């Protein structure tokens, strides 16, 4: 499903992918890369099958991808009506019924009117004379683009930071921006136990405040609760993210956290969007103090930087190390970095090694002389374009 | 200052005792045991002196006992007038001034009336038309026989356990009954730090609730606050006492807690009186809840037993082991221990070894057959005498 990777021959190992048979939908694009335009006159695919698996394998060759559905109580439809009656375009209930006539479900050929009552129960909409008007929680969910199923928990979770908050460490702030657990990595309980003990006094206070138990953490799982399970994995996700924003080596996290670099950036990119949705959610809800703490946490989770390098990182070619080594060069803001001597940044960028050898996302490789010039050149354009 | 120990010769090491010159008062009784009555016709005392210390040493010989004082703002006088006007005997202020004419200070030959004003400020006394009446705090302090200086802190300390309490472990209850630190032992910070880490999760919750800091505990003292000092040493006294009421061996405490067995009994006997004063203090103050929790903690601290052996220990001949081994013999209460077979308790008492060899306080040594018969015989008298 990714970027086009042309190749003359395509080989598939088994019709069974991860213990399950290969889907036809992904199979069409699975082979579709075979044959380069204007270079290769013939492209081929060789699916590999054994014993009785050939009967299952051949079915994909003569099979066709399944027809599309609408997937529309349903959690994907609650947001649908919330997206229209909160924007103010559709107010009368009868006109809302015509919206359900405009969807994919209607065009394919009851509970739609019974689903707005679900929103009525959860304070998302106030009932008036029927003509519906959004509430403070309803308008905040739409602006931040969260699913209404998740918001009910967040609203009761963010409001539980009202009772008690810690500020020495970023853990409690990070705990409220970790999205979920999904299946981003396989947990290691014994490894978590050793990490649980070595945690400092400040961080252990956070866990008790959000429901994580010191007495039960990597203790009962060894010897053997869905909402309690979604909290412990949420805490582990927050522990990993705190090391990410501390700029610890990514290799070191592997040796310490058990999850490899592939699932780390697939989480810090996903958790950075969450911090960009909680911040907007708290902005529209009139929580000006909470928006202050989470305002800078979207930029920190994306790039794995500290507070110091937030301004340096604004240049698109400084991801996580090209700004740290540059920061030690006496350049602490992007304003005066834009005025750096061109020949000066060449030597400092040469060092710190863990002709197109330096890499920048989007333009493949680059040479050091050009990229260092691009560091200043991009900094020129930022200073006057935003003022 | 203890029990008489006659001897024909008494020899003293140095006039300097513990880095200070020896007092005259203790010197009269220092060698007064020399010469047995009706056995020794001559008793002698030989003080050993060196170099120039002989001039200081001879002052002991020709010295006379220092004249007595009264030591009577003064903390020992606040209790003096509280103890009388709260009993109802002295009410009028002029009669109180007459009482101050009856003291040792008066008979030896201004601020007496000013010390009442100290009691007025601290709510110990309500002011009426001057005729004075007790308050709820004033009548509770007298009955429990606590110094008014200590009560002001206890009342706030015991009202902080009002808001938050823990019950799974006996630590927080023990924290409210540890008297002070005095100079019962020399603290070991590094050993406490290792002990601080190995504390379970439940006990560490108590320390944060009473002012003890996980971050600062055997951390700053190594690298280098009187009320903060008196709390940490209070916590150590409560930490030691919990092992005492867990029936752990006293030898093991020495290897683990660093304080010798001599200072342990000098604490558990002193801390047992405190539990007998806090319980009475809470009784008169109308706190019927922790009067229940602290009711059994005077007997536990005196004998270093658990809850199970509270009834067995009522017999004066079962201190801390003679009841534990007897408890495992199927005898769990003093009611049915009174009906035990005489020959049965002989064999069980013979075992558990860590003719008059078994020892009982107050009667020197005893033989096993007599003492085992005394275990039952004392239990006979208790059953009907108390009913």
């Amino acid at each position: 499903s990714g970027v086009n990777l042309p190749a003359r021959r395509v080989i598939i190992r088994t019709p069974i992918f991860g213990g399950r048979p290969l889907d036809i939908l992904t199979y069409k694009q699975m082979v579709g890369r075979a044959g380069r335009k204007g270079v290769d006159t013939v492209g081929e695919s060789i699916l590999i099958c054994k014993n009785s698996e050939k009967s299952k394998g051949i079915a994909l060759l003569q099979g066709s991808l399944k027809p599309v559905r609408s997937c529309l109580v349903t959690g994907s439809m609650i947001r649908a009506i919330l997206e229209i009656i909160v924007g103010g375009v559709a107010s009368t209930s009868q006109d809302m019924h015509t919206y359900a006539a405009c969807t994919f479900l209607a065009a394919s050929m009851g509970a739609i009117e019974a689903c707005v009552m679900w929103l009525l129960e959860n304070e998302f909409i106030q009932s008036t004379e029927k003509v519906y008007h959004p509430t403070h929680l309803g308008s905040a969910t739409l602006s931040s683009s969260l699913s209404p199923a998740d918001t009910l928990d967040i609203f009761a979770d963010l409001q539980r930071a009202m009772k008690g908050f810690v500020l020495e460490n970023d853990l409690h702030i990070l705990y409220l921006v970790t999205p979920m657990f999904e299946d981003w990595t396989t947990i290691d309980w014994y490894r978590f136990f050793c990490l649980w003990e070595k945690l400092p006094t400040s961080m252990k206070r956070v866990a008790e405040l959000v429901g994580v138990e010191e007495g039960f953490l990597a203790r009962c799982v060894k010897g053997k609760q869905h909402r309690q399970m979604a909290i412990h994995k949420r805490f582990f996700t927050s522990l990993v993210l705190l090391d990410l924003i501390s700029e610890v080596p990514l290799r070191e996290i592997n040796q310490k956290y058990g999850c490899n670099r592939g699932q780390i950036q697939s989480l810090q990119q996903s958790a950075a969007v969450y911090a960009g949705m909680i911040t907007v959610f708290s902005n529209r809800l009139g929580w000006h103090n909470m928006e202050l703490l989470l305002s800078q946490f979207q930029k920190r989770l994306t790039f794995g930087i500290q507070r110091e390098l937030c301004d340096l990182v604004r240049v698109s070619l400084l991801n996580a190390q090209r700004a740290r080594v540059l920061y030690a060069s006496g350049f602490h803001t992007v304003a005066d970095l834009a005025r750096a001597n061109i020949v000066e940044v060449e030597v400092i960028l040469k060092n710190a090694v863990p002709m197109r050898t330096i890499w920048v996302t989007g333009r493949k490789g680059l040479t050091e002389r050009e990229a260092a010039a691009l560091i200043v050149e991009e900094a020129r354009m930022i200073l006057q374009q935003d003022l």
Side-chain angles (χ1 to χ4, degrees), chain A residues 1-19 21-36 38-65 67-68 70-112 114-223 225-387:
Chain A
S1 63
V3 157
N4 32 69
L5 270 283
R8 154 288 187 169
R9 157 170 307 182
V10 175
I11 303 147
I12 307 160
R13 194 80 281 160
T14 43
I16 291 303
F17 264 131
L22 182 45
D23 173 27
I24 315 202
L25 162 54
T26 166
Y27 192 88
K28 164 62 181 173
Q29 66 185 315
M30 172 46 108
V31 172
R33 331 175 162 285
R36 213 191 270 152
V39 166
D40 272 308
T41 202
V42 153
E44 45 153 346
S45 157
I46 318 85
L47 173 70
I48 299 332
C49 329
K50 297 297 156 235
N51 39 275
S52 61
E53 292 195 329
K54 319 210 208 234
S55 92
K56 295 220 297 296
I58 183 65
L60 284 59
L61 284 313
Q62 282 145 341
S64 210
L65 71 172
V68 291
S70 41
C71 90
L72 256 61
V73 84
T74 39
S76 46
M77 152 95 81
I78 289 148
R79 188 204 300 225
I81 68 191
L82 187 82
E83 275 200 344
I84 179 65
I85 79 194
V86 182
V89 158
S91 288
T92 51
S93 201
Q94 54 96 7
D95 213 8
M96 182 296 247
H97 263 296
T98 89
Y99 184 100
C102 203
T103 176
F104 195 58
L105 250 202
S108 296
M109 336 313 174
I112 166 64
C115 155
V116 67
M117 163 56 188
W118 186 95
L119 290 182
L120 241 193
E121 176 80 273
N122 308 125
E123 105 190 284
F124 279 136
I125 313 148
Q126 58 198 1
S127 53
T128 54
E129 204 278 331
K130 291 185 176 185
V131 157
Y132 274 130
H133 280 55
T135 48
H136 273 316
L137 183 46
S139 39
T141 284
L142 189 90
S143 314
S144 35
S145 211
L146 290 119
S147 187
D150 320 330
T151 295
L152 269 193
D153 198 274
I154 279 172
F155 180 74
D157 176 22
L158 254 180
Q159 233 164 340
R160 272 256 313 289
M162 142 189 298
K163 314 318 165 202
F165 211 87
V166 306
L167 291 98
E168 48 213 294
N169 43 37
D170 302 0
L171 204 79
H172 206 166
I173 294 141
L174 270 184
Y175 175 86
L176 311 193
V177 313
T178 49
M180 279 137 288
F181 186 61
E182 308 95 287
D183 202 68
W184 78 279
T185 207
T186 48
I187 204 66
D188 251 357
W189 291 126
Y190 166 88
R191 220 212 64 253
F192 200 33
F193 212 55
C194 290
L195 194 35
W196 178 240
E197 277 202 75
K198 83 144 71 187
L199 287 198
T201 83
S202 34
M203 281 145 88
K204 215 163 271 203
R205 184 80 50 53
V206 180
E208 321 295 10
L209 227 39
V210 277
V212 183
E213 301 119 324
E214 191 174 346
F216 160 50
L217 182 38
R219 311 232 185 159
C220 272
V221 285
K222 330 287 309 173
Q225 301 318 101
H226 287 207
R227 78 277 170 199
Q228 187 70 13
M229 203 55 208
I231 286 176
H232 283 244
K233 312 154 164 273
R234 192 98 167 282
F235 184 71
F236 186 91
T237 309
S238 52
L239 261 175
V240 171
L241 278 182
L242 181 65
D243 284 25
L244 278 187
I245 58 151
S246 295
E247 308 197 50
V248 303
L250 261 176
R251 196 52 70 144
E252 179 289 3
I253 276 176
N254 214 25
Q255 187 144 280
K256 175 212 183 54
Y257 271 121
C259 47
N260 54 351
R261 35 208 162 83
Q263 324 164 292
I264 287 292
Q265 298 126 26
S266 150
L267 167 138
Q268 95 176 355
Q269 291 203 350
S270 161
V273 190
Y274 217 77
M277 289 165 5
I278 296 304
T279 284
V280 173
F281 176 64
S282 275
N283 234 357
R284 314 261 171 290
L285 259 199
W287 294 337
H288 306 270
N289 266 335
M290 200 74 201
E291 188 257 337
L292 222 33
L293 292 187
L294 311 152
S295 270
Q296 83 260 20
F297 265 74
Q298 178 184 247
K299 194 174 290 302
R300 293 186 75 212
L301 290 178
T302 301
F303 294 120
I305 67 177
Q306 295 237 39
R307 312 217 168 76
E308 317 154 310
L309 330 179
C310 274
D311 213 342
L312 256 52
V313 153
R314 198 186 324 275
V315 175
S316 56
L317 316 82
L318 309 161
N319 35 22
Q321 326 181 268
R322 303 200 271 284
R324 152 73 51 223
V325 60
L326 206 154
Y327 185 79
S329 164
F331 275 115
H332 318 318
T333 205
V334 85
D336 81 323
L337 173 53
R339 287 197 180 181
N341 193 11
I342 277 192
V343 80
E344 204 198 342
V345 290
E346 318 287 330
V347 54
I348 189 57
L349 269 163
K350 263 203 183 76
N351 298 52
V353 192
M355 191 65 277
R356 326 194 323 274
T357 85
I358 178 189
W359 197 76
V360 155
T361 279
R363 328 189 222 190
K364 256 58 148 186
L366 254 199
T367 189
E368 172 141 10
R369 294 160 309 221
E370 172 46 278
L374 286 196
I375 289 306
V376 154
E377 172 209 84
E378 173 102 346
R380 323 310 301 151
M381 186 252 266
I382 278 175
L383 282 193
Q384 51 266 41
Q385 99 162 113
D386 70 335
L387 294 182

PDB file of all heavy atoms in Angstrom, chain A residues 133-147:
ATOM      1  N   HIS A 133     -29.149  22.072  18.919  1.00  0.00           N
ATOM      2  CA  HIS A 133     -28.065  23.032  19.030  1.00  0.00           C
ATOM      3  C   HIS A 133     -26.881  22.389  19.735  1.00  0.00           C
ATOM      4  O   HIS A 133     -27.062  21.619  20.683  1.00  0.00           O
ATOM      5  CB  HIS A 133     -28.504  24.278  19.813  1.00  0.00           C
ATOM      6  CG  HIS A 133     -29.287  25.261  19.002  1.00  0.00           C
ATOM      7  ND1 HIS A 133     -30.434  24.917  18.319  1.00  0.00           N
ATOM      8  CD2 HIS A 133     -29.091  26.580  18.766  1.00  0.00           C
ATOM      9  CE1 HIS A 133     -30.911  25.982  17.699  1.00  0.00           C
ATOM     10  NE2 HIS A 133     -30.114  27.003  17.953  1.00  0.00           N
ATOM     11  N   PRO A 134     -25.661  22.704  19.314  1.00  0.00           N
ATOM     12  CA  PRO A 134     -24.485  22.087  19.933  1.00  0.00           C
ATOM     13  C   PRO A 134     -24.234  22.629  21.332  1.00  0.00           C
ATOM     14  O   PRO A 134     -24.653  23.730  21.691  1.00  0.00           O
ATOM     15  CB  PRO A 134     -23.347  22.465  18.984  1.00  0.00           C
ATOM     16  CG  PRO A 134     -23.800  23.737  18.359  1.00  0.00           C
ATOM     17  CD  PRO A 134     -25.294  23.624  18.224  1.00  0.00           C
ATOM     18  N   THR A 135     -23.531  21.828  22.124  1.00  0.00           N
ATOM     19  CA  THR A 135     -23.133  22.197  23.470  1.00  0.00           C
ATOM     20  C   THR A 135     -21.645  22.530  23.487  1.00  0.00           C
ATOM     21  O   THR A 135     -20.978  22.550  22.447  1.00  0.00           O
ATOM     22  CB  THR A 135     -23.466  21.077  24.457  1.00  0.00           C
ATOM     23  OG1 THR A 135     -23.001  19.827  23.935  1.00  0.00           O
ATOM     24  CG2 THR A 135     -24.964  20.996  24.687  1.00  0.00           C
ATOM     25  N   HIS A 136     -21.121  22.801  24.682  1.00  0.00           N
ATOM     26  CA  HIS A 136     -19.698  23.092  24.813  1.00  0.00           C
ATOM     27  C   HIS A 136     -18.858  21.855  24.524  1.00  0.00           C
ATOM     28  O   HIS A 136     -17.797  21.946  23.897  1.00  0.00           O
ATOM     29  CB  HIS A 136     -19.403  23.637  26.208  1.00  0.00           C
ATOM     30  CG  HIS A 136     -19.577  25.119  26.323  1.00  0.00           C
ATOM     31  ND1 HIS A 136     -19.109  25.999  25.371  1.00  0.00           N
ATOM     32  CD2 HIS A 136     -20.179  25.876  27.271  1.00  0.00           C
ATOM     33  CE1 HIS A 136     -19.408  27.234  25.731  1.00  0.00           C
ATOM     34  NE2 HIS A 136     -20.058  27.187  26.880  1.00  0.00           N
ATOM     35  N   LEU A 137     -19.315  20.687  24.978  1.00  0.00           N
ATOM     36  CA  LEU A 137     -18.594  19.452  24.692  1.00  0.00           C
ATOM     37  C   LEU A 137     -18.766  19.040  23.235  1.00  0.00           C
ATOM     38  O   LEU A 137     -17.842  18.492  22.625  1.00  0.00           O
ATOM     39  CB  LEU A 137     -19.066  18.338  25.624  1.00  0.00           C
ATOM     40  CG  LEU A 137     -18.345  16.997  25.496  1.00  0.00           C
ATOM     41  CD1 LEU A 137     -16.845  17.198  25.441  1.00  0.00           C
ATOM     42  CD2 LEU A 137     -18.720  16.073  26.638  1.00  0.00           C
ATOM     43  N   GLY A 138     -19.945  19.287  22.663  1.00  0.00           N
ATOM     44  CA  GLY A 138     -20.170  18.921  21.274  1.00  0.00           C
ATOM     45  C   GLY A 138     -19.318  19.721  20.309  1.00  0.00           C
ATOM     46  O   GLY A 138     -18.759  19.169  19.358  1.00  0.00           O
ATOM     47  N   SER A 139     -19.208  21.031  20.534  1.00  0.00           N
ATOM     48  CA  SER A 139     -18.407  21.868  19.650  1.00  0.00           C
ATOM     49  C   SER A 139     -16.915  21.662  19.854  1.00  0.00           C
ATOM     50  O   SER A 139     -16.137  21.901  18.924  1.00  0.00           O
ATOM     51  CB  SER A 139     -18.757  23.341  19.853  1.00  0.00           C
ATOM     52  OG  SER A 139     -18.974  23.627  21.223  1.00  0.00           O
ATOM     53  N   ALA A 140     -16.495  21.232  21.044  1.00  0.00           N
ATOM     54  CA  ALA A 140     -15.079  20.984  21.281  1.00  0.00           C
ATOM     55  C   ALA A 140     -14.619  19.694  20.613  1.00  0.00           C
ATOM     56  O   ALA A 140     -13.488  19.616  20.122  1.00  0.00           O
ATOM     57  CB  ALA A 140     -14.795  20.936  22.780  1.00  0.00           C
ATOM     58  N   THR A 141     -15.479  18.674  20.591  1.00  0.00           N
ATOM     59  CA  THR A 141     -15.123  17.414  19.948  1.00  0.00           C
ATOM     60  C   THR A 141     -14.926  17.600  18.448  1.00  0.00           C
ATOM     61  O   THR A 141     -13.977  17.065  17.863  1.00  0.00           O
ATOM     62  CB  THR A 141     -16.204  16.370  20.221  1.00  0.00           C
ATOM     63  OG1 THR A 141     -16.080  15.899  21.565  1.00  0.00           O
ATOM     64  CG2 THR A 141     -16.066  15.198  19.273  1.00  0.00           C
ATOM     65  N   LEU A 142     -15.814  18.362  17.811  1.00  0.00           N
ATOM     66  CA  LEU A 142     -15.729  18.551  16.367  1.00  0.00           C
ATOM     67  C   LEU A 142     -14.463  19.294  15.965  1.00  0.00           C
ATOM     68  O   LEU A 142     -13.794  18.912  14.998  1.00  0.00           O
ATOM     69  CB  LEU A 142     -16.960  19.298  15.868  1.00  0.00           C
ATOM     70  CG  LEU A 142     -17.029  19.334  14.350  1.00  0.00           C
ATOM     71  CD1 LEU A 142     -17.798  18.142  13.872  1.00  0.00           C
ATOM     72  CD2 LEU A 142     -17.686  20.617  13.886  1.00  0.00           C
ATOM     73  N   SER A 143     -14.124  20.364  16.683  1.00  0.00           N
ATOM     74  CA  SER A 143     -12.957  21.157  16.311  1.00  0.00           C
ATOM     75  C   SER A 143     -11.680  20.338  16.416  1.00  0.00           C
ATOM     76  O   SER A 143     -10.791  20.447  15.564  1.00  0.00           O
ATOM     77  CB  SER A 143     -12.869  22.405  17.187  1.00  0.00           C
ATOM     78  OG  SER A 143     -14.129  23.044  17.288  1.00  0.00           O
ATOM     79  N   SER A 144     -11.571  19.510  17.450  1.00  0.00           N
ATOM     80  CA  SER A 144     -10.389  18.688  17.654  1.00  0.00           C
ATOM     81  C   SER A 144     -10.401  17.407  16.836  1.00  0.00           C
ATOM     82  O   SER A 144      -9.374  16.725  16.774  1.00  0.00           O
ATOM     83  CB  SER A 144     -10.247  18.341  19.134  1.00  0.00           C
ATOM     84  OG  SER A 144     -11.518  18.153  19.728  1.00  0.00           O
ATOM     85  N   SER A 145     -11.530  17.068  16.215  1.00  0.00           N
ATOM     86  CA  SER A 145     -11.646  15.891  15.354  1.00  0.00           C
ATOM     87  C   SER A 145     -11.303  14.607  16.109  1.00  0.00           C
ATOM     88  O   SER A 145     -10.442  13.829  15.699  1.00  0.00           O
ATOM     89  CB  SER A 145     -10.779  16.039  14.101  1.00  0.00           C
ATOM     90  OG  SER A 145     -11.359  15.364  13.000  1.00  0.00           O
ATOM     91  N   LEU A 146     -11.988  14.391  17.228  1.00  0.00           N
ATOM     92  CA  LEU A 146     -11.922  13.136  17.959  1.00  0.00           C
ATOM     93  C   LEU A 146     -13.216  12.360  17.766  1.00  0.00           C
ATOM     94  O   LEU A 146     -14.286  12.943  17.573  1.00  0.00           O
ATOM     95  CB  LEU A 146     -11.691  13.352  19.458  1.00  0.00           C
ATOM     96  CG  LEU A 146     -10.344  13.871  19.952  1.00  0.00           C
ATOM     97  CD1 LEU A 146     -10.523  15.194  20.655  1.00  0.00           C
ATOM     98  CD2 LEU A 146      -9.700  12.863  20.877  1.00  0.00           C
ATOM     99  N   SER A 147     -13.108  11.039  17.814  1.00  0.00           N
ATOM    100  CA  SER A 147     -14.299  10.210  17.791  1.00  0.00           C
ATOM    101  C   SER A 147     -15.103  10.437  19.069  1.00  0.00           C
ATOM    102  O   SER A 147     -14.531  10.489  20.161  1.00  0.00           O
ATOM    103  CB  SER A 147     -13.928   8.735  17.661  1.00  0.00           C
ATOM    104  OG  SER A 147     -15.083   7.934  17.475  1.00  0.00           O
TER     105      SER A 147
END
